[PDB]
Amino acid sequence: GEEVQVIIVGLGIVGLAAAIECREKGHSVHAFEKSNILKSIGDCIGLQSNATRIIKRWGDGAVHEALRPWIVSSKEIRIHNSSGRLIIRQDLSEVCEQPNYLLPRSELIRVMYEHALKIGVEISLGVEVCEPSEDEEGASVVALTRDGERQIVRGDFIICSDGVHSKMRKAIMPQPVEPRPSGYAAFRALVDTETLKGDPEASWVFEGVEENDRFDVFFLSGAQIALQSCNKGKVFSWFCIHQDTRNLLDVWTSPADPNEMLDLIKVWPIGQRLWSVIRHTQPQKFINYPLLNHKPLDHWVSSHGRLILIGDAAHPLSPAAGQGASQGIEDANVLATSLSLAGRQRVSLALHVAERIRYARASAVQLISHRVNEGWRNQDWDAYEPNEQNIASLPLETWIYGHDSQAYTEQEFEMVVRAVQEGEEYHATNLPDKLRVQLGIRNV
Ligand SMILES: Cc1cc2nc3c(=O)[nH]c(=O)nc-3n(C[C@H](O)[C@H](O)[C@H](O)COP(=O)(O)OP(=O)(O)OC[C@H]3O[C@@H](n4cnc5c(N)ncnc54)[C@H](O)[C@@H]3O)c2cc1C
Ligand SMILES: CC1(C)c2[nH]c3cc(Cl)ccc3c2C[C@@]23CN4CCC[C@]4(C[C@@H]12)C(=O)N3
Secondary structure, eight states, X not given: OOOOEEEEEOOSHHHHHHHHHHHHTTOEEEEEESSOTTSOOSOEEEEXXXXXXXXXTGGGGHXXXXXXXXXXXXXXEEEEXXXXXXXXXXXXXXXTSSOOEEEEHHHHHHXXXXXXXXXXXXXXXXXXXXXXXEOSSOEEEEEXXXXXXXXXXXESEEEEOOOXXXXXXXXXXXXXXXXXXXXXXXXXXXXXXXXXXXXXXXXXXXXXTTTSOOEEEEEETTEEEEEEEETTTTEEEEEEEEXXXXXXXXXXXXXXXXXXXXXXXXXXXXXXXXXXXXXTSOGGGOEEEEEEEOOOOSOSBOTTSOEEEOGGGTOOOOTTSSOXXXXXXXXXXXXXXXXXXXOGGGHHHHHHHHHHHHHHHHHHHHHHHHHHHTTTTOOOTTTOXXXXXXXXOXXXXXXXXXXXXXXXXXXXXXXXXXXXXXXXXXOOOSSOHHHHHHTTOOOO
């Protein structure tokens, strides 16, 4: 009559989603995180309908109501050239049939953190998790606190949601493959709303944002720039994908030079108008984040089936594509659903079923996102005008954003169990069949 004891390593977006999913489905959760995750860092996170579908269930709608101010109200993407001329209005009516969110990462973390505490997730901040182990009966980790004290923590299995620099990953894949640089990076930041207000030369950016979030894209030679608003103009954010061969580290903390962005855009006719807004980014908030191409791992689940990698620990995606967080939320939902269907006496089965459901779909999104990183969409803008051909269409694919991962898992669970127990390949239908073979995805 004892609950499953879930251990979670890392409380980024995916670890918090895994904690909420597991706890709402009746399992005990003790989550560990090394940092103060409430600190204001990073810029905005987008969540598409495949993620909001999952989030809508949490607390019988409580989290969705907390996130309602952040529901995307853009009806179109406005695509501009280097003169600022509007070339194409790309309709978002289908993409936005169901809710999407756009909000500062720190606000999404806060909302998820508060709900996790409310529903009884046990959270331990200031803990670096080390040295996982497992056998046929259980798993354990070492909780290392900042005073150097070590505490053993035991559970039924370990959820490794510790991000792109996951140290848990080597417990599954001890020989790490190296991501290769795409040759591109992304400048990105929030704008300081206060100083943005009160700049008369930036007043244009507020037009209509109380009714429809701004979603402007600009294509210049060497730059793909987006300017967005959310929550009725309370927040403005921007990014700029650009060529960069420097040896940049993929972290969200390093100093970046705002003058590099000014130099890139000031030589084109629209540059001064864009800078009228972007100049109000706080200097220490400029991030220049490299767009690295990570190869799918061979698998996500450990030898005894009591550790699983999810989120960016399993399938890091660049922030340039828009499915990174949403796919990690699908990991959390499928894993928790699979655990609930398998039960405490079949934990390894649960993790292996979740891996079989998630792997090909997550890997397809990952491999397609490599093309956005390498700039395949770009053309010579002296000759071509940008249009829908140049917009990475991953956030526009119905097969991604229309998907209901929980319903899929419930309907397919016993078929996946049979594939796992009979040693047969499971052919998931949560991605297009042509895609899996076209991309060279190898089933686990
Ligand atoms: C500080 C920060 C800012 C970010 N800002 C943005 C942004 O503006 N836009 C965007 O699109 N993406 C951003 N990201 C990335 C984004 O969170 C992910 O791409 C994705 O949405 C969710 O990935 P995740 O939860 O799997 O991993 P992450 O979000 O990277 O979270 C991993 C967590 O695990 C913790 N952790 C790592 N190792 C250990 C350990 N041994 N023990 C305990 N805890 C550990 C880390 O402290 C971190 O909180 C940011 C990530 C970080 C870490
Ligand atoms: C910002 C992204 C993640 C995005 N976020 C969305 C949200 C909704 Cl709700 C609908 C569509 C999108 C898109 C499509 C975008 C628009 N950007 C223009 C330059 C680079 C990029 C990235 C990508 C692109 O090529 N396609």
